[PDB]
Amino acid sequence: KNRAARVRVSKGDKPVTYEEAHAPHYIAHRKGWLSLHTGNLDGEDHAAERTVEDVFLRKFMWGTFPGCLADQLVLKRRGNQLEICAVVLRQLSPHKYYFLVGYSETLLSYFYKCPVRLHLQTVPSKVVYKYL
Template structure:
């Protein structure tokens, strides 16, 4: 249930920029979110949105949240065999 909320929140915060599904890791009390984004926004706006997500989710979950962002030029085509 919490992962669904996180994925929907990230999809709404970064509309059309998610190149792949968000990866949610829990390390003890720390929540780590790994995102692969396309380069659709200027870097300053991406940094602002990253800080916004970390701050809001830290207050919401009452535990530290860290966001790891990576950008790619375009959506990465994956082929699952």
């Protein structure tokens, strides 16, 4: 049987998100892409460096906002800019969010040598697409 990126059915008590409920054969039919850049286009270059930056960002943000991320990130590149769009929870205090936004935006700008901006969208609870 196939296993990649599939959430196995259960009794019915397990909540899943939209992206987590669709398998790889829906990535261009019912889902989009979590990262958007030009590396993988025909005739373009530096697709390998853009991938290592993505892998590091998803981990930097998972450990920098522990227990706060409601769903996967959405990385966007428009020229020199790098826009990180995240959906976070409302448990943490806003004072601590503004601290981490300025700490991460700055640390990542000096690391990758690019202007970085972070966009948060708070939700009360993790959105549920269905129950498996």
